[PDB]
Amino acid sequence: ALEGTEFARAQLSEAMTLASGLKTKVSDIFSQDGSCPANTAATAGIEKDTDINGKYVAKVTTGGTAAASGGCTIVATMKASDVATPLRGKTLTLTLGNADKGSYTWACTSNADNKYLPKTCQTATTTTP
């Protein structure tokens, strides 16, 4: 008897797995400098604030307005990658509202192929071109 795989591109599993996995990573973002900067003090003496992993297939950075409560709007991206969507993964964004005295909160805001009705994850703002 022989063995082997068939699916391989189990994007379904990786999809959900990537969702919760993203929350954990983003949760660290605000936890990085205990604030919400924009890689202004990263890629210099840190190994977390400056993510953007892959060969230009992942544009992730910190953002928002916080430094005592919780207001980090991190925006991730996928350019010329090979996961989700037929062309590109597009951009995505999440928010942190822990308040530094509550129990952590989140606000989804994705911007990757949104033709169907909205739910949980909204559409990212226009942002600069």
Side-chain angles (χ1 to χ4, degrees):
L2 282 155
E3 291 194 63
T5 174
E6 211 67 69
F7 287 103
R9 211 157 298 284
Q11 210 86 241
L12 201 151
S13 200
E14 202 197 277
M16 315 198 124
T17 309
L18 191 90
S20 198
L22 201 55
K23 304 267 212 74
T24 56
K25 277 195 185 168
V26 185
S27 201
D28 276 69
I29 300 297
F30 161 85
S31 199
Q32 294 180 136
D33 286 61
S35 184
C36 298
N39 269 216
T40 55
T43 180
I46 318 173
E47 271 208 309
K48 307 189 267 156
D49 198 320
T50 174
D51 288 301
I52 305 169
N53 315 147
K55 296 206 89 88
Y56 310 112
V57 288
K59 215 79 91 149
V60 189
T61 307
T62 176
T65 308
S69 28
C72 268
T73 359
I74 294 83
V75 62
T77 330
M78 320 205 169
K79 290 263 265 170
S81 203
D82 211 316
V83 294
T85 4
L87 286 151
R88 301 158 196 280
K90 316 224 198 291
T91 75
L92 266 87
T93 314
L94 269 162
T95 310
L96 206 137
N98 58 308
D100 204 324
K101 53 144 145 166
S103 211
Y104 300 84
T105 310
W106 286 97
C108 190
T109 306
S110 168
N111 217 75
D113 57 278
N114 211 52
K115 301 214 95 174
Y116 281 101
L117 71 317
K119 56 106 145 266
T120 335
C121 291
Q122 271 212 252
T123 64
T125 178
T126 60
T127 325
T128 49

